[PDB]
Amino acid sequence: GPPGPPG
Amino acid sequence: PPGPPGP
Amino acid sequence: PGPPGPP
Amino acid sequence: PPGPPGP
Amino acid sequence: GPPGPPG
Amino acid sequence: PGPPGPP
């Protein structure tokens, strides 16, 4: 899947 | 699925 | 799953 | 998430 | 995530 | 988490 959101 | 939030 | 997001 | 407040 | 606020 | 803010 795509990268996760910024922290 | 999308990856997890960053740190 | 995708990779973690950025900091 | 955003980082913590500075010192 | 982005930097935190000034202290 | 992001890094700490500045002093």
CA D3 – CA C1 distance, rounded (Å): 25
Q: First vs last Cα of chain D: how many Å apart?
A: 18
CA E2 – CA D1 distance, rounded (Å): 7
SS3 content of chain B, % helix, strand, coil (to 5): 0, 0, 100
Q: Which helix (H) or strand (E) holds F6?
A: none
Q: How far does Cα E5 stand from its chain's mean position?
A: 4
Q: Measured between CA atoms, how close is E7 to chain D, in angstroms? A: 4
**A2/B6 Cβ within 8 A:** no
Resolution of the experimental model, in Å, one decimal: 1.2
Experimentally determined by? X-ray
**F5/D4 Cβ within 8 A:** yes
